[PDB]
Design an enzyme around this catalytic site. Structure first.
Site, short mmCIF file in Angstrom:
data_model
loop_
_atom_site.label_atom_id
_atom_site.label_comp_id
_atom_site.label_asym_id
_atom_site.label_seq_id
_atom_site.Cartn_x
_atom_site.Cartn_y
_atom_site.Cartn_z
CB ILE A 18 -0.99 0.03 1.19
CG1 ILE A 18 -0.25 -0.01 2.53
CG2 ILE A 18 -2.00 -1.09 1.09
CD1 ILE A 18 -1.18 -0.02 3.74
CD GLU A 25 9.01 -3.37 -0.13
OE1 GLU A 25 8.95 -4.28 0.73
OE2 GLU A 25 10.08 -3.01 -0.68
CG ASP A 134 5.66 16.80 5.21
OD1 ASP A 134 5.22 17.68 4.44
OD2 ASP A 134 6.02 15.68 4.81
NE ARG A 138 2.93 15.89 1.16
CZ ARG A 138 2.74 17.20 1.12
NH1 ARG A 138 1.62 17.70 0.59
NH2 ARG A 138 3.66 18.02 1.59
CG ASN A 139 2.35 13.58 5.51
OD1 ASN A 139 2.58 12.54 4.89
ND2 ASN A 139 3.15 14.64 5.46
CG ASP A 152 5.50 11.45 7.39
OD1 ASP A 152 6.38 10.58 7.61
OD2 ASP A 152 5.67 12.40 6.61
C1 P17 Z 1 -3.65 6.40 0.26
S1 P17 Z 1 -2.41 5.21 0.70
C2 P17 Z 1 -3.37 4.03 1.61
C3 P17 Z 1 -4.21 3.16 0.91
C4 P17 Z 1 -4.97 2.24 1.61
C5 P17 Z 1 -4.89 2.18 3.00
C6 P17 Z 1 -4.05 3.02 3.71
N1 P17 Z 1 -4.06 2.90 5.06
C7 P17 Z 1 -2.98 3.04 5.85
N2 P17 Z 1 -3.16 2.78 7.16
C8 P17 Z 1 -2.10 2.89 8.07
C9 P17 Z 1 -0.86 3.28 7.60
C10 P17 Z 1 0.24 3.41 8.45
C11 P17 Z 1 1.47 3.79 7.93
C12 P17 Z 1 2.61 3.93 8.75
C13 P17 Z 1 3.31 2.81 9.18
CL1 P17 Z 1 2.81 1.24 8.74
C14 P17 Z 1 4.44 2.93 9.98
C15 P17 Z 1 4.89 4.19 10.37
C16 P17 Z 1 4.20 5.32 9.94
C17 P17 Z 1 3.07 5.19 9.13
CL2 P17 Z 1 2.24 6.60 8.62
C18 P17 Z 1 1.56 4.05 6.56
O1 P17 Z 1 2.62 4.39 6.05
N3 P17 Z 1 0.48 3.91 5.76
C19 P17 Z 1 0.61 4.18 4.31
C20 P17 Z 1 -0.72 3.54 6.24
N4 P17 Z 1 -1.77 3.42 5.41
C21 P17 Z 1 -3.29 3.96 3.00
#
Ligand code: P17
Length: 275
Positions: A18, A25, A134, A138-139, A152
């Protein structure tokens, strides 16, 4: 890191990519009550010492927070490789993409409620002495209850169109420059994810701001909401609202929702004249 739960790799199953790119990733997965959906960020072998410090430092920062509008940390895998950060899963993804794909589908009161949640998260962060630097749609991540949560974290992370003038000009990042960013986020939400300043170049944006220009009113925007984002964009840092002020004002608008029906005038960029 002692505050974070160490999760065994056998409890984690990655299911679908994702996000992210070069050094890891982000996956949607399940954490093993019964299994619960999670997001999983990885750090691939070969990572540098600085990469490891920044990666686990984000987990360390997130583990210090406990708030409804801040992404929750489930735990980390640091003993085994690849290393992982495991968080709650936000079903609707990033706020900017979410609004663009759902154009016009929410009530004004729902949009303002999203802003209240973001502001409550930011008030918590600022009072915890954490400067985001930031803050942008988007965050912000959105769950299936439409709850918006700031994400983030770290100092690993300028995004000119969202950044306050003192931060651009002399690198002064404070909770008050985050307030400036919050004003841009208000505009992003009320426009369903329009790009701030549209096609102006970064240099054109900085010049427009320094000459006193500000983003114009979104369509169908409550007058109170436009006034509030305008005050977030005061050149003089000390004149901006604190996040406490923002939360208070949004709370009162939501609790008296008729206040949101008074709209600010929209400046049409096109005129259609019919006989
Ligand atoms: C638009 S992109 C998208 C698409 C579908 C679903 C989600 N749901 C979702 N939910 C939670 C997260 C969490 C994190 C995260 C993690 Cl895993 C570790 C440290 C910091 C962050 Cl912000 C993360 O990077 N993402 C992208 C998350 N995404 C996002």
């Amino acid at each position: 890191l002692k505050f974070t739960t160490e999760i065994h790799p056998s409890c984690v199953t990655r299911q679908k990519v994702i996000g992210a790119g070069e050094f890891g990733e982000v996956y949607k997965g399940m954490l093993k009550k019964k299994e619960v959906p999670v997001a999983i960020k990885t750090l691939k072998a070969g990572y540098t010492e600085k990469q490891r410090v920044d990666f686990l430092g984000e987990a360390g920062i997130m583990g210090q927070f406990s708030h409804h509008n801040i992404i929750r940390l489930e735990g980390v895998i640091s003993k085994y490789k690849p290393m992982m950060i495991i968080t709650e899963y936000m079903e609707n993804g990033a706020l900017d993409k979410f609004l663009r794909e759902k154009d016009g589908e929410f009530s004004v009161l729902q949009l303002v409620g999203m802003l209240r949640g973001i502001a409550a998260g930011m008030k918590y962060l600022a009072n915890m002495n954490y400067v985001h630097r930031d803050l942008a749609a988007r965050n912000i991540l959105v769950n299936s209850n439409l709850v918006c949560k700031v994400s983030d974290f770290g100092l690993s992370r300028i995004p000119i169109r969202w950044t306050a003038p003192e931060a651009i000009s002399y690198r002064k990042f404070t909770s008050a420059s985050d307030v400036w960013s919050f004003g841009i986020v208000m505009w992003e939400v009320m426009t369903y994810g329009e790009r701030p300043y549209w096609e102006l170049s970064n240099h054109e944006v900085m010049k427009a701001i320094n000459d006193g220009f500000r983003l114009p009113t979104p369509m169908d925007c409550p007058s109170a909401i436009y006034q509030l984002m305008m005050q977030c964009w005061q050149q003089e840092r000390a004149r901006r609202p604190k996040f406490a002020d923002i939360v208070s004002i949004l709370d009162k608008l939501i609790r008296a929702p008729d206040s949101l029906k008074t709209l600010a005038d929209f400046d049409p960029r096109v005129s259609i004249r019919l006989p």
